[PDB]
Design a protein around this ligand. Structure first.
Ligand SMILES: CCCCCCCCCCCCCCCCCC(=O)OC[C@H](COP(=O)([O-])OCC(O)COP(=O)([O-])OC[C@@H](COC(=O)CCCCCCCCCCCCCCCCC)OC(=O)CCCCCCCCCCCCCCCCC)OC(=O)CCCCCCCCCCCCCCCCC
Ligand SMILES: CCCCCCCCCCC[C@H](O)CC(=O)SCCNC(=O)CCNC(=O)[C@H](O)C(C)(C)COP(=O)(O)O
Ligand code: SF4
Ligand code: SF4
Ligand code: SF4
Ligand code: SF4
Ligand code: FES
Ligand SMILES: [K+]
Ligand SMILES: [Zn+2]
Lengths: 96, 129, 95, 115, 115, 263, 310, 209, 176
């Protein structure tokens, strides 16, 4: 979620906000600070974890050639989830 | 050797007045003449074959608008390549650049023996393969 | 294409040619702005066997220049055979 | 080879002769430059600038380098005479906008890292 | 000699009304200039060979069109122009003496590529 | 004076006995392809990338491990040598993950570079790839182990140079994995050197992760002051910021290693 | 030039596409040259009529590449991507009507006693003097020199296409204008054969160490991903060597002297532009002419200073 | 041709150009240092700098050469050579439908002869070489800058000249004119080290030192 | 093959000479020019009523840049820096680091749109279709500074134009 700085400046998804003594805040006066309000980390955190029944699962991001390079994810660790290193989708074996 | 009206000239070639380089970037610069080290990330040796001339790195600050890396050094990216050290030092001398040149570091020859991995009485024997 | 018969006749006469058959404004004759998906073919080396890259590597067949003379009865020659004379056109020799 | 071929001058005196001719031409041109370009400087200022430009290269001993310097000076003179240069080009010898850079060790130490 | 052309098609290239005599005198002049060049010169041998071949063609063929076809040098006015160019070249080669050995070898790695 | 005479593409060289094919090619300026071979490590001869044709010999030999014989002619560019390299690269890339955009090795890999220079340009592998689970060996080396090509460089280094026998291989065949079996930290003053010797992005620096690409960094050669050894180092910088520290070879001081404090 | 240095060959379909769009480009350039020449002389009207056709050809450019002018579409190895479906039909629709526009352009200029008074016997250059001044293209064939790179030294599939080379007789501005107009007509003639003889197949060399793989293979195959990565970060290495390759550009002989040191970046790239040599000859061609004739002589040498100055 | 990707080699033109290179070397031994033909059939003549006018005039005027057109005249900077500047003449023969390249060399202080008497096209090419590389051409009818700004110092196409040069231009409101200042970049050019540590082309391998 | 463009000699008989004299004295070809312009006056103009009517484009059109997401809302960019490496104008500036969830994501992604040449090489290099050139071409600004795009600016461009960006990509990806 997009929060606010103690000065009232809006904090971006990279965690950027000028401190209270930074003169560079004058650039936003009589203007606005451009912040994208769709934090991708919080959005990918909302996706469920797929209960696929295999030790190795494949993920290409969905949409075939319109996704990402196809990768194979190991699902042998029973404490962690196997997540795709391209799009963040998570996978796990059924109910351990 | 040819009919060119050979005129006697000193053997200290100095083209600094003709290069158009501002005077600050001749006396105060210090170039490095070296064979670049092998990038330890790879085991390829094809980048350690020629001599390089690089200038001393000056100040880079942060652009107030975008946070970019600014410079006031015209020679920050200037990198010349040479076949031998002698060519590099001649080029640095005729251009009036103070230089320090370091000797090329090549790998020393090494005695590799696969059969040592299974030595009967030496510590070179490996416990795993 | 909306011009009246009389205006078409006037402009055909003024230009001296029937300009209604070669209108410079495009109409329903153009191709649809939505097209079926394509299916592009693959190249000659999309093979599963008999395809080693060493047999189709153009860059690694380049050679350094052939030195035919270095300072370090034969007939005279030309760089190439003299160029043939161009012959006149058959569609329209004189424009 | 052991020796080299000249540009024009086979000796240092010939190079000096051509340098003096070029200096003469520039010295006579300066008043016409001041008038024609409508420069806000004096003729004394312009001729002192010409002299100071000549004095930058006084350390040159190679007759070929002197010859090339004379060639470039004549080129600059012809750009000035034929009004190929603008007023901005003539006024670039005088770095009026650039601030006085420090010269002593202490001020350079104060303002940054450059030697 | 056939019907005289109204034009050679090329701007500035006037029609020659007497191309055979023109070519004969040009080739004889060329052969005269080559006689001064030393016998062992490759230029002398090669240019004599080609010049005498062309001259024999200009002597075995009366008609201009078949002579042009046999010479393989374009139109006969173009052949005449090439003959004048070769005469000028031979006169210059008489002074240049390119049959002499090489003036000077290049430095050790003057032509080595890549460096 | 006991040098023997061998030929590398017909060019004669005089080598000490026991010199391998790879070294004899190295002294004419030809670098044989390799993954598992490191000159400072023991010879493994497992990646098979160094296979080369000996003239008149029907079977290729591992250049890294085979001592030259008198009168041998090494054919480093014959078609048989190229086909051996292409087959080996195909086998190495069969189960390799498609991680180049997300792998820190990209741009200075070795697998990438030798795929470009010695392997084919396309795949005929029509199956599902291997995937192994990651190992945690401390906060310094990120082990994305499904990128591992099993060259055993890390194991050989850990056992010989560092003197700790923690790295190894478990299982056999296609599911043979490099690691510690148990969950154990790879703590050693020299631990970070298995990152550089690793030819692929299997072993990577955790502090350096995702932060820079090899081509954009400026490389300043300097000396380490974290101790009195004076190890020669390269300082990678980008846009006025120090990015990482790499070893710089000096045979007399640090060879191609630095300590973890230096790194 | 880069493909010659790489010792690789573009595919036949890519070559046919390159020839077709080179002739489309020649139409664009000749329209601009003739109409701006006329506009400078004082005939503003033909400029607009033909710039509508220029806009349509801009649409062809954008449909093939996404950019109206700077396509970046023709690349060492072939072309970037294939033609979209229905593009050949639209090119055919445009070309079948374009000669009528050349007719209207000639109905205003070719026989006009004022246009000829401004171009006949203006800027006359001798054929030999054209050769010695480094002239090329129309500036050569205006003086009757029978020389065209597309025929004498063909490139791509130009040897398989039939066309005529218009040849002048007086070496003046009027003859060069007629040559450019007839070159537009012959460009239409070539375009027709390109439309009818476009072959199937790929549009870049099937060698992933020069031309990048298809995005579908890049996202599926290890070798394709590696080669995509390396081609888009380092680039392909070109074997060391130097070449001078020239084409018959619409403005004359356009060439490049490209030096390669063996790396992925050119060591030296000298660009030969016909306009450089042509504008070097302005002083010669303007001798004994009025001030208004120099405007015509500049227009007949059609000069773009992007290539004059580089 | 079962090799649709490799560029086809034409051996007839290679032989023709080889024979003509032998011919040219034999006719002018005084100036020809080396002649070679590329794998893509391009013939180069390496000459002593003294032989520029003789060799060029021979190639223009000889009835077996007839290289009437000067396609291009440029220079190449190679700092590792004592004669760093490589002068390249590209010539075209319409009569024999052939091209030839003539190369020589020079350093910063030795003048090359002007070839404007051989080709009128050389007038602007030699001015451009002088402008961008600093090579003087003796007996040039009008030698001066052609491409660079008036009063520009340096020769930008030299390999040791910085990409953005040394001065910028901007309008200054105090002095009411455009002024020149030392160059400052809000974002400096980012130098990329792209070369692979592995050898690409074994056939071009230089022998070890 | 070649052809002559001006190699016709006029006929020199009574009728032809009189034809040319009448053309000289009665200005007949000038009347033909007047007729051509008069015929063009009665043709429908090719002008379109901008901005109410727009020039036709194609799905390949290269306009304003945008950063895209997966349907999950997760960013596509995994900071490989291929676009920055290939950028002919060096218009792309990238900084990255591990995200708090461990993802490989950018912390800086700038495009100097006044350095950009709009070549589309970045969207070719991108392995995940993260950076694209969108259809927008009407984004002129009153100041130079609004053309130095941020990661937030480019992500907002992606969220703004994704509906038609995705349709264009679906239209053209089979050619890529
Ligand atoms: C001298 C003038 C004599 C009268 C001219 C009448 C005229 O042109 O009528 C149009 C009518 C159709 O012309 P068109 O170019 O074939 O029309 C194409 C479409 O059909 C056109 O189809 P459309 O759907 O566009 O038609 C609708 C159009 C129809 O417009 C008309 O009918 C205009 C009539 C003007 C009288 O009306 C409008 O668009 C409304 C806007 C009107 C604008 C102003 C009109 C003139 C005002 C004059 C000053 C008034 C104070 O003209 C003729 O039929 C030919 C007349 C020739 C006269 C001799 C040569 C001149
Ligand atoms: C209008 C405003 C101004 C606008 C215009 C401002 C610039 C005007 C001048 C532009 C040209 C510039 O001066 C460079 C040239 O010409 S350099 C000639 C060679 N210069 C030397 O120095 C050679 C070696 N020097 C010596 O041998 C002696 O030291 C010396 C000759 C100096 C005194 O000899 P003397 O016997 O002691
Ligand atoms: S290790 Fe090399 S080949 Fe494997 S994913 Fe990383 S960069 Fe690509
Ligand atoms: S982790 Fe790296 S060094 Fe160790 S075996 Fe695998 S690839 Fe080799
Ligand atoms: S369109 Fe081209 S210039 Fe613009 S950011 Fe992308 S790669 Fe760079
Ligand atoms: S936008 Fe695409 S190419 Fe650029 S860094 Fe992100 S993933 Fe890589
Ligand atoms: S290098 Fe010899 S087998 Fe791995
Ligand atoms: K590694
Ligand atoms: Zn995924």
């Amino acid at each position: 979620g997009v929060r606010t700085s103690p000065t009232g400046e809006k904090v971006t998804h990279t965690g950027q906000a000028y401190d209270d003594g930074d003169y560079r805040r004058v650039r936003f006066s009589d203007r606005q600070k451009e912040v994208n309000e769709n934090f991708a980390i919080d959005l990918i955190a909302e996706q469920p974890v797929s209960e696929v029944g295999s030790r190795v699962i494949s993920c290409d991001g969905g949409g075939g050639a319109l996704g990402h390079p196809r990768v194979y994810i190991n699902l042998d660790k029973e404490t962690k989830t196997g997540t795709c290193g391209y799009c963040g989708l998570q996978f796990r074996q059924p109910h351990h | 050797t040819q009919d060119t009206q050979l005129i006697a000239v000193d053997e200290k070639l100095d083209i600094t007045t003709l290069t158009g380089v501002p005077e600050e970037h001749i006396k105060t610069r210090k170039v490095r003449i070296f064979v670049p080290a092998r990038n330890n990330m790879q085991s390829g040796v094809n980048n350690t074959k020629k001599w390089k001339m690089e200038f001393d790195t000056r100040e880079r600050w942060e652009n107030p608008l975008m946070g970019w890396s600014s410079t006031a050094d015209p020679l920050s990216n200037l990198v010349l390549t040479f076949s031998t050290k002698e060519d590099a030092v001649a080029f640095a001398e005729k251009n009036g650049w103070s230089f320090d040149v370091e000797e090329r570091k090549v790998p020393k020859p090494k005695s590799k023996s696969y059969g040592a991995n299974f030595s009967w009485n030496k510590r070179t024997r490996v416990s795993t393969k | 294409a909306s011009a009246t018969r009389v205006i078409q006749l006037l402009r055909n006469w003024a230009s001296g040619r029937d300009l209604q058959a070669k209108l410079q404004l495009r109409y329903q004759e153009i191709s649809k702005r939505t097209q079926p998906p394509p299916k592009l073919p693959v190249g000659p080396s999309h093979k599963l066997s008999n395809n080693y890259y060493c047999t189709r590597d153009g860059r690694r067949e380049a050679m350094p220049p052939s030195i035919v003379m270095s300072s370090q009865e034969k007939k005279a020659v030309t760089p190439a055979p003299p160029i043939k004379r161009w012959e006149l056109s058959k569609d329209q020799p004189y424009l | 080879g052991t020796s080299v071929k000249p540009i024009f001058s086979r000796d240092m005196n010939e190079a000096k002769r051509r340098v003096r001719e070029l200096y003469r031409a520039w010295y006579r041109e300066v008043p016409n430059t001041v008038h024609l370009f409508q420069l806000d400087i004096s003729v004394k200022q312009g001729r002192d600038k010409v002299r100071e430009m000549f004095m930058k290269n006084a350390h040159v001993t190679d007759p070929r380098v002197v010859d090339l310097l004379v060639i470039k000076g004549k080129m600059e003179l012809e750009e000035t005479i034929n009004v190929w240069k603008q007023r901005t080009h003539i006024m670039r010898f005088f770095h009026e906008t650039e601030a006085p850079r420090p010269t002593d060790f202490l001020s350079k130490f104060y303002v940054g890292h450059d030697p | 000699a056939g019907l005289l052309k109204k034009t050679t098609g090329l701007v500035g290239l006037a029609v020659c009304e007497t191309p055979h005599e023109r070519l004969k005198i040009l080739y004889t002049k060329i052969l005269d200039v080559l006689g001064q060049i030393p016998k062992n010169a490759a230029y002398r041998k090669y240019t004599e060979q080609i010049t005498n071949e062309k001259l024999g063609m200009v002597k075995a063929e009366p008609d201009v069109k078949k002579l042009e076809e046999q010479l393989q040098g374009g139109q006969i006015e173009e052949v005449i122009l090439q003959a004048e160019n070769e005469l000028s070249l031979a006169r210059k080669m008489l002074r240049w003496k390119p049959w002499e050995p090489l003036v000077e070898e290049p430095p050790a790695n003057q032509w080595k590529w890549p460096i | 004076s006991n040098l023997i005479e061998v030929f590398v593409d017909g060019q004669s060289v005089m080598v000490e006995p026991g010199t391998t094919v790879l070294q004899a090619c190295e002294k004419v300026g030809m670098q044989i392809p390799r993954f598992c071979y490191h000159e400072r490590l023991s010879v493994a001869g497992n990646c098979r990338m160094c296979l080369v044709e000996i003239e008149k010999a029907p079977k290729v030999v591992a250049a890294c491990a085979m001592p030259v014989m008198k009168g041998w002619n090494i054919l480093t560019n014959s078609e048989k040598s190229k086909k051996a390299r292409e087959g080996v690269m195909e086998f190495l890339l069969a189960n390799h993950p498609l991680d180049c955009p997300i792998c820190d090795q990209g741009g200075e890999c070795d697998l990438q570079d030798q795929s470009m220079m010695f392997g084919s340009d396309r795949s005929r592998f029509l199956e599902g790839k291997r995937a192994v689970e990651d190992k945690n060996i401390g906060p310094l080396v990120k082990t994305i182990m499904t990128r591992c090509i099993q060259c055993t460089r890390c194991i050989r280094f850990a056992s010989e140079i560092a003197g700790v026998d923690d790295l190894g291989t478990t299982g056999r065949g296609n599911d043979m994995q490099v690691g510690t079996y148990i969950e154990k930290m790879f703590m050693s003053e020299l631990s970070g050197n298995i990152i550089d010797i690793c030819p692929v992005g299997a072993l990577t620096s955790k502090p350096y992760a995702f932060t820079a690409r090899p081509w954009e960094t400026r490389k300043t050669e300097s000396i380490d002051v974290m101790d009195a050894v004076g190890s020669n180092i390269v300082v990678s910088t980008r846009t006025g910021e120090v990015m990482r520290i790499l070893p710089r070879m000096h045979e007399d001081i640090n060879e191609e290693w630095i300590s973890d404090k230096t790194r | 030039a880069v493909e010659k240095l790489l010792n690789i060959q573009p595919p036949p379909r890519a070559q046919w596409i390159r020839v077709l769009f080179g002739e489309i480009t020649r139409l664009l350039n000749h329209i601009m040259a003739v109409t701006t020449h006329a506009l400078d002389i004082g005939a503003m009207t033909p400029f607009f009529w033909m710039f509508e056709e220029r806009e349509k050809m801009f649409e062809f450019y954008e449909r093939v590449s996404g950019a109206r002018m700077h396509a970046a579409y023709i690349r060492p190895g072939g072309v970037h991507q294939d033609l979209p479906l229905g593009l050949l039909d639209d090119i055919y629709e445009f070309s079948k009507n374009f000669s009528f526009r050349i007719d209207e352009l000639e109905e205003m200029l070719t026989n006009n006693r004022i246009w000829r008074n401004r171009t006949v016997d203006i800027g006359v250059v001798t054929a030999e003097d054209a050769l010695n001044y480094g002239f090329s293209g129309v500036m050569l064939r205006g003086s009757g020199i029978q020389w065209d790179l597309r025929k004498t030294q063909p490139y791509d599939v130009y040897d398989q296409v039939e066309f005529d080379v218009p040849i002048g007789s007086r070496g003046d501005c009027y003859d060069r204008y007629l040559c450019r107009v007839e070159e537009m007509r012959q460009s239409l003639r070539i375009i027709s054969q390109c439309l009818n003889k476009m072959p199937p197949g790929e549009i870049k060399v099937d060698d992933a160490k020069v031309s990048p793989p298809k995005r579908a293979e890049m996202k599926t195959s290890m070798e394709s991903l590696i080669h995509h990565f390396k081609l888009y970060t380092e680039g392909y290495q070109v074997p060391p060597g130097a070449t001078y390759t020239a084409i018959e550009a619409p403005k004359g002989e356009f060439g490049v002297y490209l030096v390669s040191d063996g790396s992925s970046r050119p060591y030296r790239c000298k660009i030969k532009a016909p306009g450089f040599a042509h504008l070097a000859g302005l002083d010669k061609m303007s001798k004994g002419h009025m001030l208004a004739d120099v405007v015509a002589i500049i227009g007949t040498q059609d000069i773009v200073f992007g290539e004059v100055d580089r | 041709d079962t090799r649709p990707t490799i560029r086809p080699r034409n051996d007839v033109v290679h032989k023709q150009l080889s024979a003509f290179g032998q011919y040219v070397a034999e006719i002018l031994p005084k100036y020809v240092q080396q002649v070679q033909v590329s794998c893509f059939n391009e013939l180069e003549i390496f000459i002593h700098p003294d032989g520029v006018i003789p060799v060029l005039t021979f190639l223009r005027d000889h009835t077996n050469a007839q290289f009437k057109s000067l396609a291009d005249l440029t220079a190449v900077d190679v700092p590792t050579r004592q004669n760093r500047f490589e002068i390249v003449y590209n010539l075209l023969s319409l009569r024999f439908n052939s091209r030839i390249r003539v190369k020589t060399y020079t350093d910063e202080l030795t003048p090359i002869e002007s070839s404007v008497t051989v080709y009128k096209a050389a007038n602007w090419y030699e001015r451009e070489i002088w402008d961008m590389f600093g090579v003087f051409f003796a007996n040039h009818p009008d030698l001066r800058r052609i491409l660079t700004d008036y009063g520009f110092e340096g020769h930008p196409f030299r390999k040791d000249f910085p990409l953005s040069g040394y001065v910028e231009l901007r309008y200054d409101d105090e002095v009411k004119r455009v002024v020149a200042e030392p160059v400052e970049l809000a974002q400096e050019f980012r130098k990329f080290d792209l070369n692979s540590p592995w050898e690409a082309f074994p056939a071009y391998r230089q022998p070890p030192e | 093959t070649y052809k002559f463009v001006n190699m016709r000699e006029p006929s020199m008989d009574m009728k032809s000479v009189t034809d040319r004299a009448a053309q000289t004295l009665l200005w007949t070809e000038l009347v033909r020019g007047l007729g051509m312009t008069l015929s063009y006056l009665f043709r429908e103009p090719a002008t379109i009523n901008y901005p109410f009517e727009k020039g036709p484009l194609s799905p390949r059109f290269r306009g304003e840049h945008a950063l895209r997401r997966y349907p999950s809302g997760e960013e596509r960019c995994i900071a490989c820096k291929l676009c920055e490496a290939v950028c002919p104008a060096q218009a792309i500036t990238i900084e990255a680091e591990p995200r708090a969830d461990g993802s490989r994501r950018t912390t800086r992604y700038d495009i100097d749109m006044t350095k950009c040449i709009y070549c589309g090489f970045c969207q070719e290099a991108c392995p995940v279709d993260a950076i694209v050139e969108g259809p927008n071409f009407e984004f002129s600004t009153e100041t130079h500074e609004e053309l130095l795009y941020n990661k937030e600016k480019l992500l907002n461009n992606g969220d703004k134009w994704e509906a038609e960006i995705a349709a264009n990509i679906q239209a053209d990806y089979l050619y890529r």
